[PDB]
Amino acid sequence: SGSWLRDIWDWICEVLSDFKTWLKAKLMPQL
């Protein structure tokens, strides 16, 4: 039934979401 610390990836993915949006805007060239 249980596989592993699947929910554990949310502690890093949920907190790194704001960091991704900030980088996605800085990496986007002129459009």
Side-chain angles (χ1 to χ4, degrees):
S1 304
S3 188
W4 69 284
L5 298 120
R6 184 197 73 194
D7 269 75
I8 224 311
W9 88 329
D10 193 85
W11 127 248
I12 279 310
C13 189
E14 196 121 287
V15 175
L16 198 117
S17 221
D18 198 278
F19 200 77
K20 198 137 155 274
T21 305
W22 170 84
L23 257 134
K24 207 246 164 164
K26 212 147 203 183
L27 199 83
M28 187 180 174
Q30 205 104 110
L31 206 83

